[PDB]
Enzyme design. Structure first.
Site, PDB file in Angstrom:
ATOM      1  N   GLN A  96      20.245  -4.504  58.243  1.00 51.10           N
ATOM      2  CA  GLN A  96      19.424  -5.384  59.079  1.00 51.10           C
ATOM      3  C   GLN A  96      19.401  -4.949  60.539  1.00 51.10           C
ATOM      4  O   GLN A  96      18.519  -5.390  61.300  1.00 51.10           O
ATOM      5  CB  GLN A  96      19.848  -6.791  58.998  1.00 51.10           C
ATOM      6  CG  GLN A  96      21.243  -7.048  59.596  1.00 51.10           C
ATOM      7  CD  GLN A  96      21.711  -8.424  59.380  1.00 51.10           C
ATOM      8  OE1 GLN A  96      22.284  -8.749  58.324  1.00 51.10           O
ATOM      9  NE2 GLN A  96      21.476  -9.316  60.330  1.00 51.10           N
ATOM     10  N   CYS A 103      19.413 -11.529  58.399  1.00 47.78           N
ATOM     11  CA  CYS A 103      20.187 -11.494  57.139  1.00 47.78           C
ATOM     12  C   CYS A 103      19.509 -12.357  56.062  1.00 47.78           C
ATOM     13  O   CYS A 103      19.581 -12.045  54.862  1.00 47.78           O
ATOM     14  CB  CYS A 103      21.613 -11.989  57.351  1.00 47.78           C
ATOM     15  SG  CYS A 103      21.729 -13.667  57.947  1.00 47.78           S
ATOM     16  N   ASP A 108      15.667 -20.218  51.651  1.00 45.11           N
ATOM     17  CA  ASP A 108      14.709 -21.110  50.962  1.00 45.11           C
ATOM     18  C   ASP A 108      13.351 -21.111  51.703  1.00 45.11           C
ATOM     19  O   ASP A 108      12.328 -21.251  51.069  1.00 45.11           O
ATOM     20  CB  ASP A 108      15.243 -22.519  50.918  1.00 45.11           C
ATOM     21  CG  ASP A 108      16.345 -22.677  49.843  1.00 45.11           C
ATOM     22  OD1 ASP A 108      16.557 -21.722  49.061  1.00 45.11           O
ATOM     23  OD2 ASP A 108      16.924 -23.762  49.781  1.00 45.11           O
ATOM     24  N   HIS A 165      25.891 -16.860  57.952  1.00 43.64           N
ATOM     25  CA  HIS A 165      25.400 -15.544  57.520  1.00 43.64           C
ATOM     26  C   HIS A 165      24.908 -15.679  56.090  1.00 43.64           C
ATOM     27  O   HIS A 165      25.547 -16.349  55.281  1.00 43.64           O
ATOM     28  CB  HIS A 165      26.570 -14.512  57.606  1.00 43.64           C
ATOM     29  CG  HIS A 165      26.166 -13.109  57.412  1.00 43.64           C
ATOM     30  ND1 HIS A 165      25.129 -12.489  58.129  1.00 43.64           N
ATOM     31  CD2 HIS A 165      26.659 -12.177  56.565  1.00 43.64           C
ATOM     32  CE1 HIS A 165      25.052 -11.241  57.749  1.00 43.64           C
ATOM     33  NE2 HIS A 165      25.930 -11.039  56.731  1.00 43.64           N
ATOM     34  N   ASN A 202      26.190  -7.277  51.157  1.00 44.66           N
ATOM     35  CA  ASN A 202      25.837  -7.570  52.561  1.00 44.66           C
ATOM     36  C   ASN A 202      24.621  -6.713  52.917  1.00 44.66           C
ATOM     37  O   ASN A 202      24.133  -5.891  52.119  1.00 44.66           O
ATOM     38  CB  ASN A 202      27.074  -7.334  53.438  1.00 44.66           C
ATOM     39  CG  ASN A 202      27.052  -8.070  54.762  1.00 44.66           C
ATOM     40  OD1 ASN A 202      26.082  -8.717  55.141  1.00 44.66           O
ATOM     41  ND2 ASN A 202      28.142  -7.963  55.485  1.00 44.66           N
TER      42      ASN A 202
HETATM   43  C1  LIG Z   1      21.789 -13.506  59.669  1.00 46.52           C
HETATM   44  N1  LIG Z   1      21.634 -12.356  60.287  1.00 46.52           N
HETATM   45  C2  LIG Z   1      21.844 -14.742  60.374  1.00 46.52           C
HETATM   46  N2  LIG Z   1      21.642 -14.771  61.700  1.00 46.52           N
HETATM   47  C3  LIG Z   1      21.698 -15.949  62.330  1.00 46.52           C
HETATM   48  N3  LIG Z   1      21.629 -15.965  63.701  1.00 46.52           N
HETATM   49  C4  LIG Z   1      21.869 -17.189  64.521  1.00 46.52           C
HETATM   50  C5  LIG Z   1      20.514 -17.338  65.174  1.00 46.52           C
HETATM   51  O1  LIG Z   1      20.408 -16.196  66.021  1.00 46.52           O
HETATM   52  C6  LIG Z   1      20.227 -14.979  65.262  1.00 46.52           C
HETATM   53  C7  LIG Z   1      21.524 -14.705  64.459  1.00 46.52           C
HETATM   54  N4  LIG Z   1      21.790 -17.080  61.655  1.00 46.52           N
HETATM   55  C8  LIG Z   1      21.950 -17.030  60.291  1.00 46.52           C
HETATM   56  N5  LIG Z   1      21.995 -18.167  59.499  1.00 46.52           N
HETATM   57  C9  LIG Z   1      21.289 -19.471  59.815  1.00 46.52           C
HETATM   58  C10 LIG Z   1      22.252 -20.269  60.525  1.00 46.52           C
HETATM   59  C11 LIG Z   1      23.371 -19.858  61.307  1.00 46.52           C
HETATM   60  N6  LIG Z   1      24.275 -20.735  61.885  1.00 46.52           N
HETATM   61  C12 LIG Z   1      23.981 -22.061  61.881  1.00 46.52           C
HETATM   62  C13 LIG Z   1      22.871 -22.516  61.130  1.00 46.52           C
HETATM   63  N7  LIG Z   1      22.035 -21.631  60.433  1.00 46.52           N
HETATM   64  C14 LIG Z   1      22.432 -18.043  58.090  1.00 46.52           C
HETATM   65  C15 LIG Z   1      21.176 -17.863  57.093  1.00 46.52           C
HETATM   66  C16 LIG Z   1      21.632 -18.587  55.779  1.00 46.52           C
HETATM   67  C17 LIG Z   1      22.433 -19.808  56.291  1.00 46.52           C
HETATM   68  C18 LIG Z   1      23.086 -19.308  57.556  1.00 46.52           C
HETATM   69  N8  LIG Z   1      21.979 -15.861  59.649  1.00 46.52           N
END
Ligand SMILES: *C(=[N-])c1nc(N2CCOCC2)nc(N(Cc2cnccn2)C2CCCC2)n1
Length: 217
Positions: A19, A25, A71, A163, A184
């Protein structure tokens, strides 16, 4: 459910992707789940375009390199009526204008299933469906610098996931220490060829069963 499962051996899983410096992700987790489901449907393993998702799935709630959810990606593919191949729509690691072209669509979905928030339910899903999108608490340096073995982080949260990754199987080692086999999106040099063995049936470690889902086809 069998005592172990590895969908890589059955041809459901593309090679590990990277990524880069983009919060995408969720797009790699979603493409990995849909790659599996399309393979079961058609018998053809075709790498799918995370860039299509990063650029195009804003209406469904995704935010490109600023995060998103698997989703929401599955809902975009349903709403859109398709998803391009990675070859037609290669990864750039920055959000750009939507360039979806239906001529190059190689996948579709009809919605998604949210698995019950229990590791037993996750195991039944992995055994009966294929690879499954999951969210984990990856916010410890023990995960960033993971190399090999069963990952177990006492400070992991079962509710605070940050993540998205893909469960491609489960098993046990004798060194009965059980693990989820997790793909990953940090490239092949991270972990075990790009994979981690996440502790299984250890009180929903790192929240791996808390936000698991897969697309219907
Ligand atoms: C995967 N690379 C990734 N990246 C993020 N972020 C945080 C937003 O800035 C960019 C990097 N978030 C997530 N999340 C969504 C998330 C994260 N923390 C709190 C709430 N949601 C994941 C995606 C599946 C669930 C968590 N992923």
């Amino acid at each position: 459910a069998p005592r172990s499962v590895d969908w890589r051996e059955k041809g459901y899983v593309t090679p590990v992707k990277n990524q880069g410096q983009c919060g995408s992700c969720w797009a790699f987790s979603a493409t990995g789940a849909l790659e599996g489901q399309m393979f079961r449907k058609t018998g053809r393993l075709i790498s799918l375009s995370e860039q299509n998702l990063v650029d195009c799935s804003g209406p469904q709630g995704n935010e490109g390199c600023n995060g998103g959810l698997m989703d929401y990606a599955f809902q975009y593919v349903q709403d859109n009526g398709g998803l391009d191949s990675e070859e037609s729509y290669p990864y750039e690691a920055t959000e750009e204008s939507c360039k979806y072209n239906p001529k190059y669509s190689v996948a579709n979905d009809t919605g998604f299933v949210d698995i019950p928030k229990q590791e037993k339910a996750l195991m039944k899903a992995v055994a009966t469906v294929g690879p499954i999108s999951v969210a984990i608490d990856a916010g410890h340096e023990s995960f960033l610098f993971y190399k090999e073995g069963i990952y177990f982080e006492p400070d992991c949260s079962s509710e605070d996931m940050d993540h998205g990754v893909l469960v491609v199987g489960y098993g046990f080692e004798s060194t009965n220490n059980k693990y989820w086999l997790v793909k990953n999106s940090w490239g092949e040099e991270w972990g075990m060829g790009g994979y981690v063995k996440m502790a299984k049936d250890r009180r929903n470690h790192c929240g791996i069963a808390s936000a698991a889902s897969y697309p219907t086809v």
